Design an enzyme around this catalytic site. Structure first.
Site, PDB file in Angstrom:
ATOM      1  N   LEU A  45       7.087  29.768 -20.290  1.00 18.37           N
ATOM      2  CA  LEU A  45       7.840  30.703 -20.327  1.00 18.37           C
ATOM      3  C   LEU A  45       8.289  31.543 -18.954  1.00 18.37           C
ATOM      4  O   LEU A  45       9.474  32.005 -18.730  1.00 18.37           O
ATOM      5  CB  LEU A  45       7.843  32.071 -21.330  1.00 18.37           C
ATOM      6  CG  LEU A  45       7.578  31.672 -22.928  1.00 18.37           C
ATOM      7  CD1 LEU A  45       7.082  32.845 -23.575  1.00 18.37           C
ATOM      8  CD2 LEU A  45       8.909  31.028 -23.530  1.00 18.37           C
ATOM      9  N   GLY A  46       7.400  31.159 -18.017  1.00 19.57           N
ATOM     10  CA  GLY A  46       7.535  31.883 -16.821  1.00 19.57           C
ATOM     11  C   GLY A  46       6.355  31.048 -15.994  1.00 19.57           C
ATOM     12  O   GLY A  46       5.216  31.180 -16.473  1.00 19.57           O
ATOM     13  N   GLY A  96       4.596  31.717 -11.812  1.00 17.98           N
ATOM     14  CA  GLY A  96       4.388  31.916 -10.477  1.00 17.98           C
ATOM     15  C   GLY A  96       3.717  31.067  -9.705  1.00 17.98           C
ATOM     16  O   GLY A  96       3.279  29.717 -10.034  1.00 17.98           O
ATOM     17  N   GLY A 141       0.162  32.410 -11.637  1.00 16.76           N
ATOM     18  CA  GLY A 141      -0.091  32.662 -12.857  1.00 16.76           C
ATOM     19  C   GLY A 141       1.185  32.234 -13.652  1.00 16.76           C
ATOM     20  O   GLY A 141       2.072  31.582 -13.006  1.00 16.76           O
ATOM     21  N   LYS A 188      -0.095  35.427 -21.203  1.00 20.51           N
ATOM     22  CA  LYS A 188      -0.355  35.266 -19.721  1.00 20.51           C
ATOM     23  C   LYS A 188      -1.916  34.756 -19.299  1.00 20.51           C
ATOM     24  O   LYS A 188      -2.851  35.054 -19.922  1.00 20.51           O
ATOM     25  CB  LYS A 188      -0.265  36.548 -19.108  1.00 20.51           C
ATOM     26  CG  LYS A 188      -0.065  36.509 -17.635  1.00 20.51           C
ATOM     27  CD  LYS A 188      -0.025  37.962 -16.796  1.00 20.51           C
ATOM     28  CE  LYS A 188       1.302  38.615 -16.866  1.00 20.51           C
ATOM     29  NZ  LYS A 188       1.358  39.829 -16.044  1.00 20.51           N
ATOM     30  N   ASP A 231       6.804  48.052 -10.304  1.00 20.62           N
ATOM     31  CA  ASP A 231       7.689  47.016 -10.354  1.00 20.62           C
ATOM     32  C   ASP A 231       8.914  47.118 -11.382  1.00 20.62           C
ATOM     33  O   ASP A 231       9.388  45.889 -11.841  1.00 20.62           O
ATOM     34  CB  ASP A 231       7.268  45.578 -10.377  1.00 20.62           C
ATOM     35  CG  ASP A 231       8.132  44.433  -9.622  1.00 20.62           C
ATOM     36  OD1 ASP A 231       8.979  44.806  -9.469  1.00 20.62           O
ATOM     37  OD2 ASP A 231       7.730  43.311  -9.698  1.00 20.62           O
ATOM     38  N   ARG A 254      14.685  42.547 -14.565  1.00 22.26           N
ATOM     39  CA  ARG A 254      13.697  41.476 -14.625  1.00 22.26           C
ATOM     40  C   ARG A 254      12.124  41.453 -15.175  1.00 22.26           C
ATOM     41  O   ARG A 254      11.709  40.856 -15.903  1.00 22.26           O
ATOM     42  CB  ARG A 254      13.458  40.760 -13.431  1.00 22.26           C
ATOM     43  CG  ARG A 254      12.664  41.606 -12.509  1.00 22.26           C
ATOM     44  CD  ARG A 254      12.567  40.993 -10.954  1.00 22.26           C
ATOM     45  NE  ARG A 254      11.701  41.882 -10.095  1.00 22.26           N
ATOM     46  CZ  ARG A 254      12.680  42.628  -9.475  1.00 22.26           C
ATOM     47  NH1 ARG A 254      13.875  42.872  -9.626  1.00 22.26           N
ATOM     48  NH2 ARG A 254      11.990  43.594  -8.598  1.00 22.26           N
ATOM     49  N   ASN A 255      11.811  42.966 -15.207  1.00 26.65           N
ATOM     50  CA  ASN A 255      10.627  43.225 -16.232  1.00 26.65           C
ATOM     51  C   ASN A 255      11.029  44.180 -17.195  1.00 26.65           C
ATOM     52  O   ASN A 255      10.013  45.023 -17.722  1.00 26.65           O
ATOM     53  CB  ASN A 255       9.674  43.885 -14.994  1.00 26.65           C
ATOM     54  CG  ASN A 255       8.853  43.049 -14.246  1.00 26.65           C
ATOM     55  OD1 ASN A 255       8.709  41.956 -14.666  1.00 26.65           O
ATOM     56  ND2 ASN A 255       8.842  43.381 -12.809  1.00 26.65           N
ATOM     57  N   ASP A 281       5.280  43.556 -17.058  1.00 24.46           N
ATOM     58  CA  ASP A 281       5.157  43.035 -15.680  1.00 24.46           C
ATOM     59  C   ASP A 281       4.699  41.567 -15.646  1.00 24.46           C
ATOM     60  O   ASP A 281       3.727  41.378 -16.061  1.00 24.46           O
ATOM     61  CB  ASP A 281       4.125  44.196 -14.941  1.00 24.46           C
ATOM     62  CG  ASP A 281       4.074  43.843 -13.558  1.00 24.46           C
ATOM     63  OD1 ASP A 281       5.229  44.213 -12.733  1.00 24.46           O
ATOM     64  OD2 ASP A 281       3.008  43.539 -13.061  1.00 24.46           O
TER      65      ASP A 281
HETATM   66  C1  LIG Z   1      11.753  34.693 -24.192  1.00 25.89           C
HETATM   67  N1  LIG Z   1      10.620  35.410 -24.034  1.00 25.89           N
HETATM   68  C2  LIG Z   1       9.803  35.419 -23.086  1.00 25.89           C
HETATM   69  O1  LIG Z   1      10.083  34.465 -22.129  1.00 25.89           O
HETATM   70  C3  LIG Z   1       8.711  36.524 -23.104  1.00 25.89           C
HETATM   71  C4  LIG Z   1       7.945  36.431 -21.915  1.00 25.89           C
HETATM   72  C5  LIG Z   1       6.748  37.200 -22.013  1.00 25.89           C
HETATM   73  O2  LIG Z   1       5.961  37.105 -20.760  1.00 25.89           O
HETATM   74  C6  LIG Z   1       5.187  38.072 -20.424  1.00 25.89           C
HETATM   75  C7  LIG Z   1       3.882  38.236 -20.884  1.00 25.89           C
HETATM   76  C8  LIG Z   1       2.641  39.103 -20.305  1.00 25.89           C
HETATM   77  C9  LIG Z   1       3.151  39.793 -19.702  1.00 25.89           C
HETATM   78  N2  LIG Z   1       2.264  41.024 -19.254  1.00 25.89           N
HETATM   79  C10 LIG Z   1       2.509  42.306 -18.989  1.00 25.89           C
HETATM   80  O3  LIG Z   1       3.480  42.900 -19.121  1.00 25.89           O
HETATM   81  N3  LIG Z   1       1.477  42.891 -18.544  1.00 25.89           N
HETATM   82  C11 LIG Z   1       1.604  44.264 -18.243  1.00 25.89           C
HETATM   83  C12 LIG Z   1       0.802  44.807 -16.981  1.00 25.89           C
HETATM   84  C13 LIG Z   1       0.707  46.068 -16.593  1.00 25.89           C
HETATM   85  C14 LIG Z   1       1.703  46.997 -17.152  1.00 25.89           C
HETATM   86 CL1  LIG Z   1       1.610  48.718 -16.765  1.00 25.89          CL
HETATM   87  C15 LIG Z   1       2.374  46.730 -18.247  1.00 25.89           C
HETATM   88  C16 LIG Z   1       3.551  47.742 -18.759  1.00 25.89           C
HETATM   89  F1  LIG Z   1       2.803  48.707 -19.443  1.00 25.89           F
HETATM   90  F2  LIG Z   1       4.383  48.077 -18.043  1.00 25.89           F
HETATM   91  F3  LIG Z   1       4.210  46.890 -19.636  1.00 25.89           F
HETATM   92  C17 LIG Z   1       2.454  45.323 -18.831  1.00 25.89           C
HETATM   93  C18 LIG Z   1       4.722  40.136 -19.284  1.00 25.89           C
HETATM   94  C19 LIG Z   1       5.419  39.029 -19.565  1.00 25.89           C
HETATM   95  C20 LIG Z   1       6.494  38.121 -22.969  1.00 25.89           C
HETATM   96  C21 LIG Z   1       7.228  38.190 -24.130  1.00 25.89           C
HETATM   97  N4  LIG Z   1       8.483  37.056 -24.113  1.00 25.89           N
END
Ligand SMILES: CNC(=O)c1cc(Oc2ccc(NC(=O)Nc3ccc(Cl)c(C(F)(F)F)c3)cc2)ccn1
Length: 305
Positions: free
Chosen positions: A34-35, A37, A40, A62, A165, A169-170, A183
């Site tokens: 799905l993503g 880097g 990661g 992740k 961040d 995008r986040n 994130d």
């Molecule tokens: C089509 N759908 C997708 O591609 C998709 C992709 C995903 O990918 C991800 C998977 C895991 C994460 N991990 C976090 O977000 N870690 C995080 C760390 C610190 C802090 Cl402080 C935070 C917070 F609190 F800010 F949220 C969050 C991010 C994106 C998730 C859902 N769907």
């Protein structure tokens, strides 16, 4: 003051309760990425019975990738610990479980958000927007998303965490118009992504950063408020890139400290634009808090109806 200090600066001392969070690797069916880097990645999976007995759930995991070292592994574990400490909120991507047992990679399992990142999604809906047509976005949606992110950020602040961040995008979009702060971190290729600009050895999201962050490397909840203002501009431009046509250089940084702000985006209301301006106050302490943003955006959402 260590009571002001963001948890995450001292993650290494937080607990990992395996009896609560550990999920069997054999109950996770890994699917498409799905993503990715450099170090990661996030991949889609089907998890059997992760949050509800005997029910298959699409999730996002992740994990690390070729190029990562022991230090990225430590970093992902401390990310898992901070997500546990933070806990559940509608408007933050929810942690569902982890695989941490030796013999396989560290995996941090969170909810899958059907529609992906908000920037890309909004930019796909320019032809499907009306200010006031099923599946069309409206001004109500946009204000509602803004309100939701402020709620999630107010929650993050309540947990003594900051983001660092914050950007469209986040933000992830789920079913039923629910948006979630996330994130991507290591799962985003920040060297290929033009949103991150070389500054020293680091690659940084300069267009989203508060002057005190750019010049003094100061990260606080109030610099997150500055980024939230940029996120607002992204929402009300339907996913446009901030500071359009502007070279992000030392003179950009200078003019920003001097008081130059973006112009109103195409889909904003006057009070939404003023809110962006408020978030972009030169003095961090004169910016609204997330609690104040919640109240104000809640009032705007109500006024819109
Ligand atoms: C089509 N759908 C997708 O591609 C998709 C992709 C995903 O990918 C991800 C998977 C895991 C994460 N991990 C976090 O977000 N870690 C995080 C760390 C610190 C802090 Cl402080 C935070 C917070 F609190 F800010 F949220 C969050 C991010 C994106 C998730 C859902 N769907």
């Amino acid at each position: 003051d260590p009571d002001e200090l963001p948890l995450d600066e001292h993650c290494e001392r937080l607990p990992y309760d395996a009896s609560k969070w550990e999920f069997p690797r054999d109950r996770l069916k890994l699917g498409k990425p799905l993503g990715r880097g450099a170090f990661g990645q996030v991949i889609e999976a089907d998890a059997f019975g992760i949050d509800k007995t005997a029910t298959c759930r699409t999730v996002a995991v992740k994990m690390l990738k070729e190029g990562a070292t022991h230090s990225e592994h430590r970093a992902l574990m401390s990310e898992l610990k901070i997500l546990i400490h933070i806990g559940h909120h509608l408007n933050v991507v929810n942690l569902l479980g982890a695989c941490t047992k030796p013999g396989g990679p560290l995996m941090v399992i969170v909810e899958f958000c059907k529609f992906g990142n908000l920037s890309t999604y909004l930019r796909s809906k320019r032809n499907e927007f009306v200010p006031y047509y099923k599946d069309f976005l409206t001004l109500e949606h946009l204000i509602c998303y803004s309100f939701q992110v402020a709620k999630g950020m107010e929650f993050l602040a309540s947990r003594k965490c900051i983001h660092r961040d914050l950007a469209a995008r986040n933000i992830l979009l789920s079913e039923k118009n629910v948006v979630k702060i996330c994130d991507f971190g290591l799962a985003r290729d920040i060297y290929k992504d033009p949103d991150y600009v070389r500054k020293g050895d680091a690659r940084l999201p300069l267009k989203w950063m508060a002057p005190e962050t750019i010049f003094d490397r100061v990260y606080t909840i109030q610099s997150d408020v500055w980024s939230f203002g940029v996120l607002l501009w992204e929402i009300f431009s339907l996913g446009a890139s901030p500071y359009p046509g502007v070279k992000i250089d030392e003179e950009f940084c200078r003019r920003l400290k001097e008081g130059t702000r973006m112009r109103a985006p195409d889909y904003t209301t006057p009070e939404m634009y003023q809110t962006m301006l408020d978030c972009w106050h030169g003095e961090p302490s004169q910016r609204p808090t997330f609690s104040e943003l919640v109240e104000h955006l809640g009032n705007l959402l109500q006024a819109n109806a």
